[PDB]
Amino acid sequence: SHRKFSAPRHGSLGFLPRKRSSRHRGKVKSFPKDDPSKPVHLTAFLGYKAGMTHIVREVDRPGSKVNKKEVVEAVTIVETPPMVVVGIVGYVETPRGLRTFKTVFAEHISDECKRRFYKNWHKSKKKAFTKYCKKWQDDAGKRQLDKDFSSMKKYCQVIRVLAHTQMRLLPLRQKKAHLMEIQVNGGTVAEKLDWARERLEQQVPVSQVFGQDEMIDVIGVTKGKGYKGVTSRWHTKKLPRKTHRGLRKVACIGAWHPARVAFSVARAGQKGYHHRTEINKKIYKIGQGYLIKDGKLIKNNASTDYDLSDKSINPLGGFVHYGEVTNDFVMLKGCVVGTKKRVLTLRKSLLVQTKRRALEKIDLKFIDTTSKFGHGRFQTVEEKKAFMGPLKKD
């Protein structure tokens, strides 16, 4: 017979091989389509997830019931140091797809990027690119290099530059940086390679890639949760208490006469650590980093134009399980994918966005930087000791 009461289907078949993903950092499956009218720009970046925080801002959207009222909103802080460009990759379009043409690296490559080519940096004798880097300081070598830059000018269509993180600035344990091909969308192939090789071997910060108040897409693997049953993975209904062989299951796998079990049946396996791509995350703030001026460091990241405090984006006692965000960062609306200390690929949106919720200007009033290791109730150390007075430690 049929199904007695029709109900919608648990889970989605669009995300169907729910497995541990093969790649740790999330990769970009599609960059935005380039048009030659724009100036050249990187269409992605790469920063690491630090933690979660409030904001307070006044919403100016006409016609809502929250017009000129004052919300709080959950934000995520992605600590985002400037990435170091190391090489450019060209691609020719083929009837079988889009194959790579000629990868050309820089001369000097930082050791934190060199670590990526080694499953064991300890026992290796660190010999990578040593025969290759000699192609820059001899005349026959750089004639060969001008030859294949000229070939990449002639035969390539899309051009994407290798850039790695600068891991020695992060509070993490690891040192082995992350490398990424970021597509240079902008002018022609000539102007594209000109920009790419003149910014070869040097840095590029966040603000040259993203602007403030801009919807981006966040890519990464989720927070892995292990081998888990159908109730905790596929959210099927728990069978009642009286069930003999356990209740946290799916009762009927499939019908008789399709003599298999279909791939659409909700079964127990790996939950979490899946590659995911969420879209339309609004950037509220692109923070300046810690830097030195006139001898003392200037620190006030979490200061707004309505607060003028001296507090930074770091809460009391640092972000829990991450560390202290010192250099540049982006502050995004709501939550993104993955646990703390997680590499988290940012990129541009493929969509054109002419709607006012994507076009809302953002004026922040208060970034609640209290302690996350409990119930924090003080914004900063000076306010805490000025409220509590002298302790016995003094």
């Binding site: 009837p95 079988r96 797809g97 499939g254 399709p258 298999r260 079990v261 279909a262 791939f263």
Partner: protein, 199 residues
């Protein structure tokens, strides 16, 4: 030792029938530019037959199902496999002998392509009937590379046009050479004309 067939103007199964038997006889056949293969009947019936082929699908796990190849070269490869006995070693050896390309790649752009008049749409269709282009059907049904193959074919048509102009002016030099030298090759020419090579 290798047939290079063009694919423009040939009917799908009516070309695959000659190619199947010719490959079972041990030839090596390269059917090139398979986005120019015609199919008889009109375009809407032909894409309805292909969408029916898409709907036919293994229910419990379509990963095991019929792999509907969307590229035109592989649609033609699947129909040659339909005409060959591919479950056995001689049919699989035949499918190893057959190579099929979209567009005309650089191993075979510098060669001369054959045509099969027994499969050719200007012969085996009445001129008022409708036909259907396999490349436009395949793009219509999910092949992604019509535009890049079209631009690459435009490039090779330009470069072959340059080659053809130079071959023309070479053969003009050849006939001016013959008219300059006929007085002293006349005794070599007329012995070919009496044996019917040159009239």
């Amino acid at each position: 030792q290798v047939l290079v067939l063009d694919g423009r103007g040939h009917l799908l199964g009516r070309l695959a029938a000659i190619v199947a038997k010719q490959v079972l006889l041990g030839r090596k056949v390269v059917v090139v530019r398979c986005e120019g293969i015609n199919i008889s009947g009109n375009f809407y019936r032909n894409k309805l037959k292909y969408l029916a082929f898409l709907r036919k699908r293994m229910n419990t796990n379509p990963s095991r199902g019929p792999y509907h190849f969307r590229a035109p070269s592989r649609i033609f490869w699947r129909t040659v496999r339909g005409m060959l006995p591919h479950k056995t070693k001689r049919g699989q050896a035949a499918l190893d002998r057959l190579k099929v390309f979209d567009g005309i790649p650089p191993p075979y752009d510098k060669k001369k392509r054959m045509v099969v008049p027994a499969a050719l749409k200007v012969v085996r269709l009445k001129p008022t009937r409708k036909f259907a282009y396999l490349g436009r059907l395949a793009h219509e049904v999910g092949w992604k590379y019509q535009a890049v193959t079209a631009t690459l074919e435009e490039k090779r048509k330009e470069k072959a046009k340059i080659h053809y102009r130079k071959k023309k002016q070479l053969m003009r030099l050849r006939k001016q050479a013959e008219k300059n030298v006929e007085k002293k090759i006349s005794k070599f020419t007329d012995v070919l004309k009496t044996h019917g090579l040159l009239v």
